[PDB]
Write a protein that binds this ligand. Structure first.
Ligand SMILES: Nc1ncnc2c1ncn2[C@@H]1O[C@H](COP(=O)(O)OP(=O)(O)CP(=O)(O)O)[C@@H](O)[C@H]1O
Ligand SMILES: C[S@@+](CC[C@H](N)C(=O)[O-])C[C@H]1O[C@@H](n2cnc3c(N)ncnc32)[C@H](O)[C@@H]1O
Ligand SMILES: [Mg+2]
Ligand SMILES: [Mg+2]
Ligand SMILES: [Mg+2]
Ligand SMILES: [Mg+2]
Ligand SMILES: [Mg+2]
Ligand SMILES: [Mg+2]
Lengths: 400, 400
């Protein structure tokens, strides 16, 4: 009864296309900082709503503005001159039965806690000003969310679509795992100088990949330009070892391409994030739920970070489409699968207006052989969409 | 001498796929407000930079946060209780040879002027607080003039990427023209109750299109819920006529699906924008430069609104790719044309690393019959990239 449509599409697989471009904005990137703050605020509000009332109340904190500060990085240790200003926005329930909910206290505390754990060399108390302007949702949009027990499956709060796909190409996996490696605790233990503001661009032309990495180096961990260049080489070497595990194509690796040692220009920072130096961020300006920006693929413009995991489809459908695509790619003979799920505002989220599954079958296979299998996969995920909510609160899935 | 490559691509045309999704956020939509303000601020800064110094100085105002307020909409005329808060962010040159440039005065005045001309029932002076945190750039004019002399066409410092396509499918044209119609001046005088916060979602399933419209209705123009339902029907009728002008497919029109008259839930607003109440906005969260959100196509994540129209290569490339595609589709026999432009480091931006032109020819035609014509089109646009910049500053091209 669910509007699931499985169709064959003709197209050159991404792996066979001549030009493939993939980008990822690391954790310390201002846009990703905004995403992370939005998500941390949302999850904190969920937990606190449950802790106080045993139920999640309406709130979408998918609105964070990172206003870059000013800093003077110096080898051996720089200084921030003007702190980073972060405006928390969005919607949250502040009035609960005439009692006041600590919206701003929870949001600001969650934002700060995320920055403390995400950016290691960022002094949150002195390098960051966090203000909260989170408002209260509209009397009507709040009503569809409030239909809890009335609708065991929550109703969709908007008419929006989520887009996912699978499997990842070699270039996509390379870009994704490059950022994850350079921002993993293990790699940080090995090279503390590598900040979190890491931007990875993978550009494949034929069977040759150019992997450009922009990695902010913490100036307190490098005393001289030579130490900085050595940190760059270790980044390169680590990514070389990783690339050999991911693809047999030739991989050219470039680290901080804007550097000009002859002019003393170096990508060093005080805190490890370019947000310190006049670079701005906001929600929905970077990675999709799969952690990548893939113009060779298809994407939804719906941001996932900060949206409640109960009713907002921009987050739920982007996650579900990705998971449906992954399961199809993992179990059925498909070269590629793209999933698009469209909500109708005021319809249960398990009854999308359409769940489009476009498949490129592997050579020798026809879609009629497994179309019902793909149908069942999407139907089961849509029938268990509520599980995605738990996956968010239990920190089992990332949204950027 | 330009690396323009015209290739044939074999793939299911969008018009031929079973499921197509298209979305457009009208001018009054909070995200579109942020985009519109971002671009309006940028254009105001450009004009004022030129008026004072005869040259545009660096600036990026692609950071605007529309914080929803609070309102009590009532049939016959409601009231705003908490004004909308808009934060202008980004960076701009405020010190020009140590003399002060009115960055914030220009920006806030431009944001207000854009709102006054965009949302007709919005009292900007009492319903909106606009504050600016745009950062300070310092420039010595001798340097900007010297980097002209040296390079008339700016050189690319990074690998930037633009994507365009043409022609628009019937569903894309239907979504686009629906928003344009309902937000046209003629329709506004005929139905003043229809606000500017108009979001159109088009779903094509085979040869049946479901067209969902979310239109904020001005509560001062509808005296009773019945008049509100009547306005909805008038929208439906106008779009029915428009649909018959575009396609011979079955078109189902749905307007404000969240309404629940039995519980008094209505999409009425005081100002004609949901920014007054339960929706927030930020830049780069909605339409692409072609005015649409198209998951069946290849979109860029890059926000174009607010980015400098002379120096930001990603914005001009996305616009140029769109224009190249449109010119190709309107002049040559192609079912579809996808245009991708990649810049080459330290080369002029009119000398891209590659200008990929992928074309699906119409039946009976082959690409080699018209490949040189498509080459010339893209070559001419790349040679007139500066004129395109002028078109942007002269408000002759839209970016959302
Ligand atoms: N010296 C430097 N070298 C390389 N990268 C740097 C850098 N300083 C900052 N960066 C990184 O580049 C980003 C700003 O560069 P830029 O504005 O040209 O990219 P962009 O136009 O694509 C906006 P976005 O970063 O959101 O994609 C910073 O946020 C940071 O991640
Ligand atoms: C549904 S709101 C997003 C949800 C909201 N931000 C929240 O916190 O739940 C997004 C867009 O939908 C439209 N919209 C707002 N209220 C609506 C309603 N009651 N019915 C239909 N569409 C609505 C507006 O154009 C708005 O920009
Ligand atoms: Mg950005
Ligand atoms: Mg939002
Ligand atoms: Mg949305
Ligand atoms: Mg939005
Ligand atoms: Mg750049
Ligand atoms: Mg970028």
């Amino acid at each position: 009864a669910r509007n699931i449509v499985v169709e064959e599409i003709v197209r050159t697989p991404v792996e066979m296309q001549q030009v493939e471009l993939v980008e990822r904005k690391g954790i310390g990137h201002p846009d990703s900082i905004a995403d992370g703050i939005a998500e941390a605020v949302s999850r904190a509000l969920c937990r606190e709503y449950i802790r106080r009332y045993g139920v999640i109340l309406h709130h979408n904190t998918d609105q964070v503005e990172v206003v870059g500060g000013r800093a003077y990085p110096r080898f051996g240790g720089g200084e921030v001159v003007k702190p980073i200003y972060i405006l928390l926005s969005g919607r949250a329930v502040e009035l609960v039965d005439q009692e006041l909910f600590p919206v701003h206290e929870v949001a600001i505390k969650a934002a700060k806690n995320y920055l403390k754990n995400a950016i290691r060399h960022l002094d949150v108390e002195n390098h960051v000003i966090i203000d909260s302007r989170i408002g209260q949702g509209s009397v009507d949009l709040v009503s569809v969310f409030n239909k809890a027990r009335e609708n065991p499956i929550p109703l969709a709060n908007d008419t929006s679509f989520g887009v996912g796909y699978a499997p990842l190409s070699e270039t996509e996996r390379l870009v994704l795992e490059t950022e994850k490696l350079l921002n993993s605790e293990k790699f940080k233990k090995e090279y503390p100088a590598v900040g979190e503001d890491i931007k990875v661009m993978g550009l494949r032309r034929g069977n040759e990949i150019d992997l450009t990495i922009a990695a902010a180096i913490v100036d307190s961990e490098v005393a001289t330009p030579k130490e900085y260049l050595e940190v760059k080489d270790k980044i390169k070497e680590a990514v070389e070892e990783l690339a050999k595990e991911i693809t047999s194509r030739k991989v050219n690796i470039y680290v901080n391409t804007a550097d000009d040692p002859e002019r003393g220009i170096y990508y060093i920072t005080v805190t490890g994030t370019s947000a310190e130096a006049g670079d701005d961020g906001s929600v929905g300006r970077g990675n999709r739920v799969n952690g990548l920006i893939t113009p060779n693929r298809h994407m939804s413009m719906e941001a996932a970070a900060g949206k409640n995991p109960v009713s907002h489809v921009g987050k739920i459908y982007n996650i579900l489409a990705m998971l449906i695509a992954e399961d199809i790619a993992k179990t059925l003979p498909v070269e590629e699968v793209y999933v698009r799920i469209l909500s109708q505002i005021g319809k249960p989220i398990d009854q999308p207006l359409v769940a489009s599954i476009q498949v490129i079958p592997k050579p020798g296979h026809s879609v009629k052989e497994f179309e019902k299998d793909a149908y069942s996969i999407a139907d089961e995920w849509l029938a268990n969409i509520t599980k995605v909510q738990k996956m968010i609160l239990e920190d089992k899935i990332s949204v950027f």
